[PDB]
């Protein structure tokens, strides 16, 4: 008896959230803490206590936060900046550990693979940071000519997927191979910015991507064969995608005109539900530790938490 609430369970106010499609401003940690980048500050919200901590604020004018990403075990937070910095923060003692520089432009995307932090920049380059050592910059992946707005390591760490405003999807190897730091695959089918990038948690080599306003499609790939398994028209820009193993489904966030979230059944790609409420385009989606709740951040300066994947007794 699958009951999906058509409304959110809770709404958080996100004043001054930056309405920039290419930034990745929210992330839900394994310890149940949402990190939210509001203009030039990062706020942490405990989903357990409802408590808020202002972790940091930029000190120079013009500066703003361009990305946030939790480390796997949820005690450290990576923060990308418009000044091309990748900062590492210890949230427990509430102090900055590192201010890693190496990029030439704002860092809009982040993704952890254990002790390796990968960062995407407006410049088009991707950097691997070994956050444990002095010379953190240990690699450079260059396969985009525009901003890297999507960046995601596979759960098993065997691939890194990147999506850009140059309409390309690149699948990179976990380490340099017979070709060095060159993509294993490059997909060109999308005709718009690819910010949505998510790996299937129960299928190692399966990747889902989503295109922007001029594409409007969700595409499923097998990154070994390099085949497109499916191309579904969503009739709206696709900003993020998340998988749920609870019922084996996908959820995507969208913009004009409905600004809705859509739940799809996998692998049929049948439309299961539409979640309406946001009054401006959705920007990002993040998932709670237990997988039951999805947080959607939108240009309407709210964060809507949807209990859409709960396993009811
Ligand atoms: C310091 C503070 N306490 C509540 C709010 N506020 O404006 O709501 N502020 C301003 C900073 O902004 C947020 O802290 N936004 C938060 N939203 C929120 N909304 C209602 C209840 C608790 N938190 C998150 Cl998005 Cl969770 Cl970080």
UniProtKB/Swiss-Prot annotation:
Belongs to the WD repeat CDC20/Fizzy family. This is Cell division cycle protein 20 homolog. It is found in: Cytoplasm, Cytoskeleton, Microtubule organizing center, Centrosome; Chromosome, Centromere, Kinetochore; Cytoplasm, Cytoskeleton, Spindle pole. The chain holds residues 165 to 477 of 499 of the full protein. It comes from Homo sapiens (Human). Changing residue 64 to C: In OZEMA14; decreased function in metaphase/anaphase transition of meiosis I; does not fully rescue metaphase I arrest in CDC20-knocked down mouse oocytes; decreased function in positive regulation of anaphase-promoting complex-dependent catabolic process; shows normal kinetochore localization. The lineage of its organism: Eukaryota, Metazoa, Chordata, Craniata, Vertebrata. The gene is CDC20. One of its GO terms (biological process) is metaphase/anaphase transition of cell cycle. Pathway: Protein modification; protein ubiquitination. Component of a complex with CDC20, CDC27, SPATC1 and TUBG1. Interacts with NEUROD2. Interacts with dimeric MAD2L1 in its closed conformation form. Interacts with BUB1B. The phosphorylated form interacts with APC/C. Interacts with NINL. May interact with MAD2L2. Interacts with CDK5RAP2. Interacts with SIRT2. Interacts with isoform 1 of NEK2. Interacts with HSF1 (via phosphorylated form); this interaction occurs in mitosis in a MAD2L1-dependent manner and prevents PLK1-stimulated degradation of HSF1 by blocking the recruitment of the SCF(BTRC) ubiquitin ligase complex. Changing residue 158 to Q: In OZEMA14; severely decreased function in metaphase/anaphase transition of meiosis I; does not fully rescue metaphase I arrest in CDC20-knocked down mouse oocytes; decreased function in positive regulation of anaphase-promoting complex-dependent catabolic process; shows normal kinetochore localization.
